Design a protein around this ligand. Sequence first.
Ligand code: SF4
Ligand code: SF4
Lengths: 157, 178, 96, 91, 79, 67, 381, 310, 56
Amino acid sequence: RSRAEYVVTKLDDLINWARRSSLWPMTFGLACCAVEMMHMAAPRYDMDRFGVVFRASPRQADVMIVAGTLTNKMAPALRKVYDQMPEPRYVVSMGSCANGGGYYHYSYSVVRGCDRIVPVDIYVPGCPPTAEALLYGILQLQRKIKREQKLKIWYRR
Amino acid sequence: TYKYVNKKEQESEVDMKSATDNAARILMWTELIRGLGMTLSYLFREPATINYPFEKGPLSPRFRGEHALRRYPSGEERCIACKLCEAICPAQAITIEAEPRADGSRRTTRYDIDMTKCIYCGFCQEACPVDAIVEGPNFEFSTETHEELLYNKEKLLNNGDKWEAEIAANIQADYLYR
Amino acid sequence: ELVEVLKRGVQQVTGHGGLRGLLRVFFRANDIRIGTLVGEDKYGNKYYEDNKQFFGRHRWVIYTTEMNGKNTFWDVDGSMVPPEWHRWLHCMTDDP
Amino acid sequence: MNLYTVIFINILLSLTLILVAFWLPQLPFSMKFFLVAITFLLFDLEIALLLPLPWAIQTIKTSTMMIMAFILVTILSLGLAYEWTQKGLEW
Amino acid sequence: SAFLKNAWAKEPVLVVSFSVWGLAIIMPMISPYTKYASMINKATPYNYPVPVRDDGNMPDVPSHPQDPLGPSLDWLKNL
Amino acid sequence: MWFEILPGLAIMGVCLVIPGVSTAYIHKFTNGGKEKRVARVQYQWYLMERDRRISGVNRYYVSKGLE
Amino acid sequence: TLNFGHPAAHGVLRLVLELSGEMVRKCDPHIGLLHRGTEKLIEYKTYLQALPYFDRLDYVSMMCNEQAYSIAVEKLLNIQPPPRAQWIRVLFGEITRILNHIMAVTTHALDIGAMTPFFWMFEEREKMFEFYERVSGARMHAAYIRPGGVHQDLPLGLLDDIYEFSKNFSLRIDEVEEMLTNNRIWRNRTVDIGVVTAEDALNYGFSGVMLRGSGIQWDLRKTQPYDVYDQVEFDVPIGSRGDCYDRYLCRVEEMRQSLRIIEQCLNKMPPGEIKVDDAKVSPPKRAEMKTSMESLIHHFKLYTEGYQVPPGATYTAIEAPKGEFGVYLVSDGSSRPYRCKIKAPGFAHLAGLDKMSKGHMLADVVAIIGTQDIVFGEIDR
Amino acid sequence: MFFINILTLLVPILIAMAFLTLVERKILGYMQLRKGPNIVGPYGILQPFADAMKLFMKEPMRPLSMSLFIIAPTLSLTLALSLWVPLPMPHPLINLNLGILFILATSSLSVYSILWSGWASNSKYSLFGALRAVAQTISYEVTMAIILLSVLLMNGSYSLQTLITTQEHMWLLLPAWPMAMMWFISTLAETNRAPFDLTEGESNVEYAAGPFALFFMAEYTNIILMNALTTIIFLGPLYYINLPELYSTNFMMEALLLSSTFLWIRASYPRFRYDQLMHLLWKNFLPLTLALCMWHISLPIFTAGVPPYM
Amino acid sequence: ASATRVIQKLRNWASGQDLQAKLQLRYQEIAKRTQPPPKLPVGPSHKLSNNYYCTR
Ligand code: SF4
Ligand code: SF4
C-alpha cells in the first residue's frame, strides 16, 4: 500500500517483532520464584525456543524478572540494576512476594511489592507462580510489545 | 551402615601395563572423549519440551491455581460469611465484611482476596464449611496492572461462574480423599 | 528404515490440508504433527490427541482464527481454551 | 592494492555497523602476570629465530642447520625448565 | 627406574616430551638417508649453471648436458 | 528431533561453499578460462609480464606456435 | 576490596572480598538481602498458618523442612502421626533430598561452567514436582506435611508413578555421573578445594554433608531416628578427605541411597489413616464436619483459633538435605507460638566460607559456595 | 569482478556467522533434551536475524575515551573477517606467499582490542580481567605459533596454498596428529570458547547493543575461521584440479563437523581454572610442542624428505 | 522412543547404556488419569464405644 502512515506502521511492526522475538531476560534470583523459572529454562518448558536467554548480564538484558521477596536491603540494588539495564527494557514481577508483599507483606524488612522500586510491566501471580504461568506472563509481555507503536507516535507527533 | 566414597582400599603398585593405560588416559584425553559420547547420545534422544500455548503441562485435580467463589446450582452464592476463611488465611489476604441481606439471609457485602498478598496455600479451600471458596484450576491470570490482581466479590463470583464446570469436576474427583 | 520415517513425514505434511493448511500450522503452531480431532469447541479451537507421543505431547490444541472478536491467527494465548476443555488439555481429566 | 581494496571494505563494514549501532537506537598490580608477559616475548622472539627454519631447511649445510636449531630449542626449553624450577610458572 | 615408571603414569607428558627430544637428536645421527638431505637440496638447480670456457684441458666437464660425463641424480631418481 | 538442527546447518554450509566456488570461477572468468597465474617468485611475474607484451595487453591471451 | 554480588553465586551473595591479586585473601559475606522476618511473623500466626512459612526457608527442600516443624509441634503436643503418614513423610522426604541434590550438583556445575547436567536432571525434577502437585496441588510449597500427620491421602496412582520414576532415575544419575565425575576438568576444579579438617568441621557447627565429607560419621536419620527411619535401611555415604569432590561424590551417593529408601517405602507402606484421629489436633474430615456437630465445632475452632499446644519448648532436628534443620519452638499455652528459632544448615556453612576458602582464587570461591548447598532463604530467614 | 569476489567471501561468511549462532542454540539444545529455538520463523531460521536487530535497536551505550571503546569491536570484526581473505578454499582470493604468517599476525592483533577494552572500562578489575585474558590469547599464541612452524617445515612454505599439494595423498593428521589435538585445543582457547572461556566467565559484559554485536560477530566468524584452518592445514580436503568445488564441498563438510565439535565440547565440559589453563599450555603442551618441533626439523633431514620450496 | 533402530544403537553406544530400556520421556506407562474413586479407611478412635477422649 502507499502512504507514509502504512510504511511507519509496517516498520515498527518490524521493530516490535525483533524486540518481541528476542527478549534477553535477566533474573535477579531472589527467594524461590527463581527456581520456578530455572524450570522454565529447563527442558519441559524451554524458554530459548521462544527466544529467551537463560542467563543475561544487565547491560545485555531486555527483561528483568524479579522473582522473590524484595527486602529493604536488596531494594537499593534492584533499582541500580534496573537503572543500568539498556534503555529498551521491561520488568516482569514474578511471585506474590514481588508483585505485592505476599506472605511477608507486613514484615519490617520486606518492600511491599517491587512496583514501589521498579516500574512493573506484567505481574505473574502465584506463591511459586507455575512455570507455565511465567511462560504465559512472558508471552503476555510479547503481546504488550507487539501493541507498542513508537514509530507511529513520532510520525503524528 | 556407612559407605566410603573416594576411599582407595589399597595401593595398587604401578605395573607398566597399568602405567601405560594411565599415561594414555592423560595423553589422549580418553575420559574426556567418554564425556563427549554421552552428549552426542542425547542429541539423538527426543526432546522433552512441550509447545506451551498448544500443549499444556499436566496438572491433576488438587492444583490450587486461581481463587473462585462458587454458587449453588439454584443460583444462590455458596458463601454464608462465617468468615473463618479470613481467620485461617496465613497472609491476611481475604477481607470479608457482611450484613443480613434483604432476603434475611447471611451474605458477604464485600469479599476481597488480595492475590498479591495470597501465597496460594489452599487452606481457604480446606476451611470453608459450604466450600464456597475454592482453588480453581486456572494459573494463567497474569495482569498488566497491580490493581487488577486485587479481586473483589464480583471478579471471584465471575471467576467462579466461568470455571464452575471444571471446578465441579475437580471437587468431584477429590472429595472422597478429603 | 529411513524410508519409513520419511514416509510418516509425508503423511504429516500432506495431512494438514493442502499447503495452505500446512503453512497455517507450520507458522502459527510451529508443529507439523497429525492427530485425531477429539472435538471442536464453540469458540473454534480444535483439540487433538496422539497417544503414541510422550505424555507431555499427546494432547494439543490448535487455537482458532478469531475468538470473541479478536483475531487469533498469530496472537494465540493459552486462555483461549474454554474452561470445559482446559482440564482435558492439562490432563486433569482423561475424558474429552 | 587488491589487499588494500579488501581491507578498506573490511573496516568500512565494521565502522558502518558501529555507526548505525550508535545512530539507529534513535590500581590493580602483580608480578606473575607481568612476568609471563616477559616470558611471552622471550618465547615470541624465539619464535622469530625459528621462523626462518622453512627456508633454512633447504640450506645446503643441513648439519649446521639442525645443530643450530636443536641448540636454540634446547636452550630456551632449559629457560623454561628454570622458570618451572623457580616459583615462576607457578603463579 | 621406578620413578621413571610412575613418571610414565604420572606426569606422562614430560616423559614423552623428553623422549621425543632425544629421538630427534638420534635419528639424524643414525640413518641411511640423512646424507641425502644435503644432496637432494644441493642438487635442486635454482641458479643458472654458467658454462666454463673450453681450454680443452678438461675431460671431466661434459661438453653437453646430455653427455655421459658430469654429475647425475639417479641417486635422486629411484631414491 | 535432531533433524530440525539441519535446516540451520544447511544454510551455513551453502554459505561456506559459495565463497570457494565463487572465488574459483570469478578467477577462471577474468583470466580467460585459465587459472590466474600465481606469481610467487619474480621469474613467474616476468614470464607473466612477458606474456602481456606478447599479445593484446592481457597475459591470459596466449599466442602459440602459429605466431 | 572487590564487592562481588546477579552474582554468579546461588541466591544473592554480596561477598565482600579482598583480592590480593587474583588470589583472594579474605571474604566477608554480607547476607541479609533476603531476611523476610520469618520468625517474627510466625509469633503472630497460629501453628497451622505458620506451616507454610517453613516451606519457604530452604526453598529447594520444602517437605523435609515442613517435617521438622511437624515433628516439633507434634512433640509439644505429645501426639504421634499415624503409621501411613510417617511412611509418606519418609517417602516425600527422600524425593526432596533427590530434588535438593539434583539442585545442588547441577547448579554447582552451572557455576563451574558445565551446562548440560542441569538440563537433563531438571526434566527429572519436574517429573518429581508433579508428585508434589499430584499429592498437594502445589508443584513446590505444598503444605502437605501437617503439624499432626499429613493433609490428604496419596492419590490412587502416585505410588505406581513414583516406582516408574525411581525405576529409571538411577540411569539419569549414572549419566551426569559419566559427564562430571572423572572429567579432569571437574576433578581439577573440585579436588583439593575447600578441604575442612574433621574437628574444625564440628567446631564450626557444619553438621551436614560437610560434616560427613571429612569423614565424621553423623546422620540424624540413623543416629536419632525421626519418623520411620528406624524401619528403612540405607548406608550413609561418608567421604574420606573433604575436598569439594568428596562432598560431591557424597551428594551423588545420597541420591542413590535415597532411591534405596524410596524403594522400601513403596514396598512397605501400611494401609491406614494419614492424620492422627484426635480432632483436637488434626481437622475433622469433610463428610464428618458436615454431618456431626462435634466435628463442626472442632473444625470451626481449629481453623479459627488453633491447636493450643501445651506450654513448653523443644529443639527438634531432622536431616534436611542441606544438613541439620532444627526448630526451637518455645510455646506458651496459646494457639500461636512464642518463638521459633529456625536453625538453618547454611548459617553455619556460610560462616565457614572464610576459613574454607583460604589461599584460594576468585574462581575457587564460586566452587566453595556451591559445595555448601547454601540457599539464602534458610540463612536469611 | 574483484569486488564481486570480495562480496562473495564476506557476505556469505557473515551469514554463516549468523546461522552458527542458531546452530549453537539447537545442537546444545538436543544434547540437553530441549528443541532449541524453532518458534520464530521456520525451524528457527529467522532467529539469528531477530536478536541482532534487537541489539542494534537497544539504545546507545552509556560508558566512560569513547574510542578505545568503539575501536575495540571494529578491530575485532575487522581482523576476523580480514583473516578470511587469504584462506585457500580451493583458490584463495588474495594469494599471499607468506600466508600463514598473515593469519598468525592478524590473530595476534585481536589482543590489542582486549587490552584497550580494559583501559576504556575505567574499572580497575576490568583491567584485571583484561590482562587476565592477554595470557589466554598470547600464551595460547606461543604454542599456537610453534605448532604451525612444525607444520610449515613439513609443507615447505608459509603459503596456505601449498598444503593443497602437500595433502594430495594423505591428511596431515595422520602424520602430526599429536599436534592436531594441540592445535584443536589451542583453537579452543583462542576463540575463548568453553573449555577455555573466562571472557564471559567470572562476570564483554561491558558492551551492549551494537558493540556487543560486533565482537560477538567476530568471535563466531573466528570460530569458523580457525576450524577452517584446521580443515586446510591438518585435514586436507581432496583436491581435483579439473573440478575445484569438491575441494570446497569437502572443505564445507570438514569445517562444519569441526565447528560442530567445539559446540559439542562446550556443552560437554566444565570450564578450566585460570591457572589450570596456563598450567596446561606452559607445563603440559609447550614442552611437548618444542620437542615435537625439533622432531619436525629432524624428520625431514634424516628421512631425506626436505620439502620442496615453492 | 519412536527412534529408528540405528539412532537407538548409536544412542545406546555413545552413552554406553541401554537408554532405551529406561527412557526419560513417559509413554503410556504413567498412571492413567481418573484413577478409580477412593474409599479411604477410617482410623482408630472411630469406635462408638470405649472411645473416651480422656483416655486418648
Ligand atoms: S512468592 Fe511465594 S514463592 Fe515466590 S518467593 Fe514469595 S514466597 Fe517464595
Ligand atoms: S469460609 Fe467459605 S463460606 Fe465461610 S466465608 Fe469464607 S468463603 Fe464464605
